[PDB]
Scaffold this active site. Structure first.
Site, PDB file in Angstrom:
ATOM      1  N   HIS A   1     113.771  13.433  38.118  1.00  0.00           N
ATOM      2  CA  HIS A   1     112.409  13.921  38.201  1.00  0.00           C
ATOM      3  C   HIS A   1     112.348  15.018  39.238  1.00  0.00           C
ATOM      4  O   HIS A   1     113.337  15.254  39.951  1.00  0.00           O
ATOM      5  CB  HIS A   1     111.426  12.786  38.572  1.00  0.00           C
ATOM      6  CG  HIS A   1     111.721  12.183  39.903  1.00  0.00           C
ATOM      7  ND1 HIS A   1     112.616  11.167  40.090  1.00  0.00           N
ATOM      8  CD2 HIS A   1     111.324  12.557  41.141  1.00  0.00           C
ATOM      9  CE1 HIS A   1     112.731  10.937  41.399  1.00  0.00           C
ATOM     10  NE2 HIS A   1     111.940  11.777  42.075  1.00  0.00           N
TER      11      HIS A   1
ATOM     12  N   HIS B   1     115.415  15.459  41.858  1.00  0.00           N
ATOM     13  CA  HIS B   1     116.071  14.231  42.267  1.00  0.00           C
ATOM     14  C   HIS B   1     116.728  13.576  41.100  1.00  0.00           C
ATOM     15  O   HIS B   1     116.050  13.149  40.148  1.00  0.00           O
ATOM     16  CB  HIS B   1     115.047  13.257  42.876  1.00  0.00           C
ATOM     17  CG  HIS B   1     114.530  13.723  44.200  1.00  0.00           C
ATOM     18  ND1 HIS B   1     113.354  13.269  44.776  1.00  0.00           N
ATOM     19  CD2 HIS B   1     115.076  14.628  45.039  1.00  0.00           C
ATOM     20  CE1 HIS B   1     113.215  13.893  45.915  1.00  0.00           C
ATOM     21  NE2 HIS B   1     114.234  14.726  46.123  1.00  0.00           N
TER      22      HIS B   1
ATOM     23  N   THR C   1     111.192   8.330  48.255  1.00  0.00           N
ATOM     24  CA  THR C   1     110.149   9.160  48.784  1.00  0.00           C
ATOM     25  C   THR C   1     108.774   8.870  48.244  1.00  0.00           C
ATOM     26  O   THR C   1     107.798   9.532  48.596  1.00  0.00           O
ATOM     27  CB  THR C   1     110.456  10.645  48.709  1.00  0.00           C
ATOM     28  OG1 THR C   1     110.323  11.042  47.349  1.00  0.00           O
ATOM     29  CG2 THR C   1     111.800  11.003  49.296  1.00  0.00           C
TER      30      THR C   1
ATOM     31  N   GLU D   1     110.593  18.343  49.159  1.00  0.00           N
ATOM     32  CA  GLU D   1     110.445  17.197  50.064  1.00  0.00           C
ATOM     33  C   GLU D   1     111.349  17.408  51.286  1.00  0.00           C
ATOM     34  O   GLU D   1     110.863  17.522  52.413  1.00  0.00           O
ATOM     35  CB  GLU D   1     110.749  15.916  49.307  1.00  0.00           C
ATOM     36  CG  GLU D   1     109.736  15.683  48.175  1.00  0.00           C
ATOM     37  CD  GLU D   1     109.545  14.266  47.810  1.00  0.00           C
ATOM     38  OE1 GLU D   1     110.578  13.586  47.555  1.00  0.00           O
ATOM     39  OE2 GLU D   1     108.389  13.809  47.779  1.00  0.00           O
TER      40      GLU D   1
ATOM     41  N   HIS E   1     102.598  10.450  38.586  1.00  0.00           N
ATOM     42  CA  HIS E   1     103.084  10.956  39.923  1.00  0.00           C
ATOM     43  C   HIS E   1     104.123  12.048  39.765  1.00  0.00           C
ATOM     44  O   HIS E   1     104.261  12.897  40.664  1.00  0.00           O
ATOM     45  CB  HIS E   1     103.705   9.830  40.683  1.00  0.00           C
ATOM     46  CG  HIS E   1     102.802   8.661  40.895  1.00  0.00           C
ATOM     47  ND1 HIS E   1     102.986   7.414  40.387  1.00  0.00           N
ATOM     48  CD2 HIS E   1     101.672   8.598  41.642  1.00  0.00           C
ATOM     49  CE1 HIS E   1     101.946   6.595  40.717  1.00  0.00           C
ATOM     50  NE2 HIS E   1     101.190   7.313  41.561  1.00  0.00           N
TER      51      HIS E   1
ATOM     52  N   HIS F   1     109.696  17.178  42.285  1.00  0.00           N
ATOM     53  CA  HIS F   1     108.515  17.324  43.098  1.00  0.00           C
ATOM     54  C   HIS F   1     108.255  18.828  43.231  1.00  0.00           C
ATOM     55  O   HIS F   1     109.226  19.579  43.363  1.00  0.00           O
ATOM     56  CB  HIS F   1     108.742  16.712  44.523  1.00  0.00           C
ATOM     57  CG  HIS F   1     109.178  15.304  44.475  1.00  0.00           C
ATOM     58  ND1 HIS F   1     108.319  14.241  44.555  1.00  0.00           N
ATOM     59  CD2 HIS F   1     110.395  14.743  44.287  1.00  0.00           C
ATOM     60  CE1 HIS F   1     109.014  13.132  44.448  1.00  0.00           C
ATOM     61  NE2 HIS F   1     110.298  13.406  44.275  1.00  0.00           N
TER      62      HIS F   1
HETATM   63 ZN    ZN Z   1     111.853  12.124  44.033  1.00  0.00          ZN
END
Ligand code: ZN
Length: 257
Positions: free
Chosen positions: A91, A116, A195, A103, A61, A93
């Site tokens: 990590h 994050h 999230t 996000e 992910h 996104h």
């Molecule tokens: Zn995150």
């Protein structure tokens, strides 16, 4: 079997994780015209001088850079927080295109990516207990735009070839997360959630106003990662972001005028 595809993306998550439609979901749009300055907010204290990175993992992910969270080595305090929060992992996104990937959004603007840094409240003893509490986690969110390279990211980028596919890990010691921070620690804060599933409403979000810049080559390397495991059909790890959720009965507070 949640993910970011057509059949298993954010709009499906509620079937297995009904809190996806809860009262305190993240991310949100940050309306800079309605967030109010809160003079009771204190400066953030980011203490990462003793941070001990251990490993980097492709979890299918995203990828997580993991830390030793068995002592107060890398901690976040101050700001909106009571107590001490230990860094466990960071990590990102990111998008398939530079016009999407974050996000949180700012006045509906999407950034190319979002970092994050995940921390848990030491009063709850372990991450797994912390996520069961409304004040269990503090996540520092940092926007990425494409421009100049970020030198402090390049060590992460260069290891990604070794963790292309789901389940792969690699030793990743001596990485300094201070090299991912912008100059200013001005922020917005609000109460929200993880999230990704399980979407638990355990997070004090601290979103920095100032983005960091990364180069187009750096982001390109993120986009060569794979969601799939080795020996399975290749599906590029892109667009691993959840869109903004309803603010509901929350206020976003600003640390800055
Ligand atoms: Zn995150």
């Amino acid at each position: 079997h949640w993910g970011y595809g057509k059949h298993n993306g954010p709009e499906h998550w509620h079937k297995d994780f009904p809190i996806a439609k809860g009262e305190r979901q993240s991310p949100v749009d940050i309306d800079t015209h309605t967030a109010k300055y809160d003079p009771s907010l204190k400066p953030l204290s980011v203490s990462y001088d003793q941070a001990t990175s251990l490993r980097i993992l492709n979890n299918g992910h995203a990828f997580n850079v993991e830390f030793d969270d068995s002592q107060d080595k890398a901690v976040l305090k101050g700001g909106p927080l009571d107590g001490t929060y230990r860094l466990i992992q960071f990590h990102f996104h990111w998008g398939s295109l530079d016009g999407q990937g974050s996000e949180h959004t700012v006045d509906k603007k999407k950034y190319a990516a979002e970092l994050h840094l995940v921390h848990w409240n030491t009063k709850y003893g372990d991450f797994g207990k912390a996520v069961q509490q409304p004040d269990g986690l503090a996540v520092l969110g940092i926007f990425l735009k494409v421009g100049s390279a970020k030198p402090g990211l390049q060590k992460v980028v260069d290891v990604l070839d070794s963790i292309k596919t789901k389940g792969k890990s690699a030793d990743f010691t001596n990485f300094d997360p201070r090299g991912l921070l912008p100059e200013s620690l001005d922020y917005w804060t609000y109460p929200g959630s993880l999230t990704t599933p399980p979407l638990l409403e355990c997070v004090t979000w601290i979103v920095l106003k100032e983005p960091i810049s990364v180069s187009s080559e750096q982001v390109l390397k993120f986009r060569k990662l794979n969601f799939n495991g080795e020996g399975e059909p290749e599906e590029l790890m892109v667009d691993n972001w959840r869109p903004a959720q309803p603010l509901k009965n929350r206020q976003i507070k600003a640390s800055f005028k």
